[PDB]
């Protein structure tokens, strides 16, 4: 083993993160099962949280892997889609007639956050206004990440098979498909994934690629980038933030739900003390997520990052919406 175990061979990752982004009630979910098949019916808006659907195709040899990213309307509504939107991955923005010009909003929200990250531009619900169209030349010169406008409906299946096939094709394209993993990478992926811990400490994860090939720490930091961007974990790397790598996507949200929802900082105009996050963490029943306490910064932290919450000083926060 010895002389033959310096270096190693290199597989291609070809994975890529699919964000499904765009107001509420607008074409997100259903546009989602069109693109594996799953039909129409008119109930999807009972479909509701975070979704994710691991969805693959293969173009000549290469076996293409997909990671969709579906967001409900607690996400959207309360902004904390935010978390989870990252570079080097895919962006579908879904629009419709009603909401007049919403569409430019969404283009600086994804190019803040997505970077050189492509977008494709669904215009959803013609049945219901055939004559909803946008100033094209002007976005796409704009923003240079839109690579392709397409009218479609959902309910009629009308343009999916054209936006499927542009998908297909950007989807090869992006910047990190031809990029190639060592062996030891796709293992470390690999155990994460099966993974069923809502997080995990930066301790556990170095032990973890100790555990696999590599363990240095430069390989280390370059391989968690990565799996943030391919949406095996959630991770910042923001001093208060960097102990926690999420799992669960679900175990952020709820926690900042919880928080949102309290009926104790209803009252109080929304002065949130961190004494009173043992009551509102608490588990109560029937499979509430465990918050450590340790992990209270974090999510407050979390929270102050993309201004769901303002510091008044440093053991309190305030939440305008109850105020
Ligand atoms: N007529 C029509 N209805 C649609 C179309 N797409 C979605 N809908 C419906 O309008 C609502 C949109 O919600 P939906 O796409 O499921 O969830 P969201 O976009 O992720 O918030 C649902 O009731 C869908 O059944 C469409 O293309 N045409
Ligand atoms: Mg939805």
Redesign the pocket.
């Known amino acids: 083993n010895y002389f033959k175990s310096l270096e190693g061979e290199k597989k291609p990752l070809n994975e890529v993160k699919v964000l499904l982004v765009?107001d509420?009630?607008?074409?997100?979910?259903?546009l989602l099962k069109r693109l594996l098949g799953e039909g129409?019916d008119?109930?999807?808006?009972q479909?509701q949280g975070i979704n994710i659907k691991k969805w693959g195709f293969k173009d000549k040899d290469k076996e293409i892997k997909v990671n969709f990213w579906?967001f409900g309307?607690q996400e959207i509504m309360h902004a904390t889609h935010q978390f989870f939107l990252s570079k080097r991955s895919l962006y579908i923005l879904?629009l419709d007639s009603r909401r007049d010009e919403k569409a430019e909003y969404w283009l600086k929200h994804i190019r803040s956050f997505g970077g050189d990250s492509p977008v494709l531009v669904a215009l959803?619900?013609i049945?219901?206004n055939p004559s909803f169209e946008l100033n094209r030349k002007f976005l796409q010169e704009k923003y240079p990440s839109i690579k392709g406008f397409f009218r479609?409906?959902?309910?009629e299946d009308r343009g999916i098979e054209g936006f499927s096939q542009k998908l297909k094709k950007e989807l090869l394209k992006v910047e990190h498909m031809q990029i190639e993993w060592a062996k030891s990478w796709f293992e470390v992926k690999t155990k994460l994934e099966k993974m069923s811990c809502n997080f995990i400490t930066y301790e556990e994860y170095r032990n973890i690629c100790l555990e696999e090939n590599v363990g240095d720490k430069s390989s280390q930091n370059t391989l968690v980038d990565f799996l943030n961007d391919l949406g095996v974990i959630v991770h910042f790397k923001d001093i208060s933030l960097l102990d926690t790598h999420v799992l669960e996507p679900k175990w952020i949200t709820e926690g900042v739900y919880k928080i949102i929802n309290s009926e104790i900082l209803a009252k109080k105009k929304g002065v949130l003390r961190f004494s009173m996050l043992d009551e509102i963490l608490e588990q109560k029943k029937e499979g509430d997520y465990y918050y450590p306490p340790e992990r209270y910064g974090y999510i407050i932290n979390l929270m102050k990052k993309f201004e769901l919450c303002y510091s008044i000083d440093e053991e309190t926060v305030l939440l305008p919406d109850l105020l």
């Open positions: 765009g509420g009630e607008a074409g997100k979910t259903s129409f008119g109930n999807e808006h479909t579906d309307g879904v959803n619900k049945d219901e479609i409906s959902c309910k």
